[PDB]
Amino acid sequence: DPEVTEDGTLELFIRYESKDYINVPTPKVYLNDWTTRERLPIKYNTVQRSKDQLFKSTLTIKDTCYSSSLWAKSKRNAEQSAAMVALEIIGIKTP
Ligand SMILES: [Cl-]
């Protein structure tokens, strides 16, 4: 049951842990493979905020937006966490 923001973005509080994906495909890879098979448009729109220099990414798949509600220490972490939100909400099986 994701949180829904005012503009309709679907969010979950997710931190990306790179240690869980050492030498294996990352969440962005799984999500990209799925959107490629479905021919779905996918884009990441990432921002860094001035107050603490953390990052947040809004991933759009077709006309649906997903993002992590946890601001991340890096651009990569914000994008990977947003991909994990999309994977978990859509229900895409990952290892
Ligand atoms: Cl982080």
Residue numbers in the entry: 6 to 100
Source paper text:
The dihydrouridine biosynthetic reaction is catalyzed by a large family of flavoenzymes, the dihydrouridine synthases (Dus). Dus2 is the eukaryotic enzyme responsible for the synthesis of D20 in tRNAs and is involved in some human cancers and in the detoxification of β-amyloid peptides in Alzheimer’s disease. Overall, the structural analyses of all these structures allow for the definition of a canonical Dus fold, which consists of: (i) a TIM-barrel domain on the N-terminal side carrying the active site with the FMN located in the center of the barrel; (ii) a helical domain (HD) formed by 4 helices in a bundle lying on the C-terminal side; and (iii) a linker, which connects these two domains. In contrast, hDus2 was shown to carry an additional domain after the HD, namely a double-strand binding domain (dsRBD) cooperating with the TIM-barrel for tRNA recognition and binding.
The other domain acquired by more evolved Dus2 is the dsRBD. By reanalyzing the sequences of eukaryotic Dus2, we found out that the dsRBD does not seem to be restricted to animals but is also present in Choanoflagellates and in Filasterea, all of which are part of the Filozoa clade. To determine if the dsRBDs of animals at the bottom of the evolutionary tree retain the same double-stranded RNA recognition mechanism compared to the dsRBD of hDus2, we crystallized the dsRBD of Dus2 from A. queenslandica, Monosiga brevicolis, and F. alba. Unfortunately, only A. quenslandica dsRBD led to diffracting crystals that allowed structural resolution. Interestingly, the validity of these models is supported by the superposition of the crystallographic structure of A. quenslandica dsRBD, which we solved at 1.68 angstroms in this study, with the dsRBD coming from the model (RMSD = 0.426 over 78 atoms). It is equally amazing to see that even the orientations of the side chains observed in the crystal structure are globally preserved in the model. A focus on specifically the dsRBD revealed that the overall structure is conserved among all the models. We showed that recognition of dsRNA is essentially achieved via three major canonical regions, namely helix-α1, helix-α2, and the C-terminal part of the β1–β2 loop of the dsRBD. These regions are all present in all dsRBDs analyzed here. In contrast, only one of these positively charged residues is observed in F. alba (R400) and A. queenslandica (K381).
